[PDB]
């Protein structure tokens, strides 16, 4: 059940827009990021200039982009 790369392995650039936050497209620490099971994307809670600091750690939740659905 280890993490897998979707558009990174196929893309020579090896960007992790999916596994990593699309804003950074990789070059980040997915351990401090939360993944959305519905969108399977990372949130910037810690990438914004100011860090959210709460870091739920649960990593199991939905991002506000799809929660409004
Ligand atoms: Zn990836
Ligand atoms: Zn980022
Ligand atoms: Zn989502």
UniProtKB/Swiss-Prot annotation:
Phosphorylation at Ser-1 of the linker region decreases the binding to H3K9me3. Ubiquitinated; which leads to proteasomal degradation. Autoubiquitinated; interaction with USP7 leads to deubiquitination and prevents degradation. Polyubiquitination may be stimulated by DNA damage. It is found in: Nucleus. The modification Phosphoserine is found at residue 1. Changing residue 1 to A: Diminishes phosphorylation by PKA. The record marks 30, 33 as: Histone H3R2me0 binding. A zinc finger (PHD-type) spans 13-69. Expressed in thymus, bone marrow, testis, lung and heart. Overexpressed in breast cancer. Induction: Up-regulated in proliferating cells, and down-regulated in quiescent cells. Down-regulated upon adriamycin-induced DNA damage, in a p53/TP53 and CDKN1A-dependent way. Induced by E2F1 transcription factor. Signal peptide: none annotated. Residues 1-4 are annotated as: Linker. The record marks 19 as: Histone H3K4me0 binding. Residues 36-40, 56-58 are annotated as: Histone H3R2me0 binding. Changing residue 33 to A/K: Does not affect ability to bind histone H3 peptide. It is linked to Defects in UHRF1 may be a cause of cancers. Overexpressed in many different forms of human cancers, including bladder, breast, cervical, colorectal and prostate cancers, as well as pancreatic adenocarcinomas, rhabdomyosarcomas and gliomas. Plays an important role in the correlation of histone modification and gene silencing in cancer progression. Expression is associated with a poor prognosis in patients with various cancers, suggesting that it participates in cancer progression. The tudor-like regions specifically recognize and bind histone H3 unmethylated at 'Arg-2' (H3R2me0), while the PHD-type zinc finger specifically recognizes and binds histone H3 trimethylated at 'Lys-9' (H3K9me3). The tudor-like regions simultaneously recognizes H3K9me3 through a conserved aromatic cage in the first tudor-like subdomain and unmodified H3K4 (H3K4me0) within a groove between the tandem subdomains. The YDG domain (also named SRA domain) specifically recognizes and binds hemimethylated DNA at replication forks (DNA that is only methylated on the mother strand of replicating DNA). It contains a binding pocket that accommodates the 5-methylcytosine that is flipped out of the duplex DNA. 2 specialized loops reach through the resulting gap in the DNA from both the major and the minor grooves to read the other 3 bases of the CpG duplex. The major groove loop confers both specificity for the CpG dinucleotide and discrimination against methylation of deoxycytidine of the complementary strand. Interacts with DNMT3A and DNMT3B. Interacts with DNMT1; the interaction is direct. Interacts with USP7; leading to its deubiquitination. Interacts with histone H3. Interacts with HDAC1, but not with HDAC2. Interacts with BLTP3A. Interacts with PML. Interacts with EHMT2. Binds hemimethylated CpG containing oligonucleotides. Interacts with ZNF263; recruited to the SIX3 promoter along with other proteins involved in chromatin modification and transcriptional corepression where it contributes to transcriptional repression. Interacts with UHRF2. Interacts with FANCD2. Multidomain protein that acts as a key epigenetic regulator by bridging DNA methylation and chromatin modification. Specifically recognizes and binds hemimethylated DNA at replication forks via its YDG domain and recruits DNMT1 methyltransferase to ensure faithful propagation of the DNA methylation patterns through DNA replication. This is E3 ubiquitin-protein ligase UHRF1. It comes from Homo sapiens. The chain holds residues 298 to 366 of 793 of the full protein.
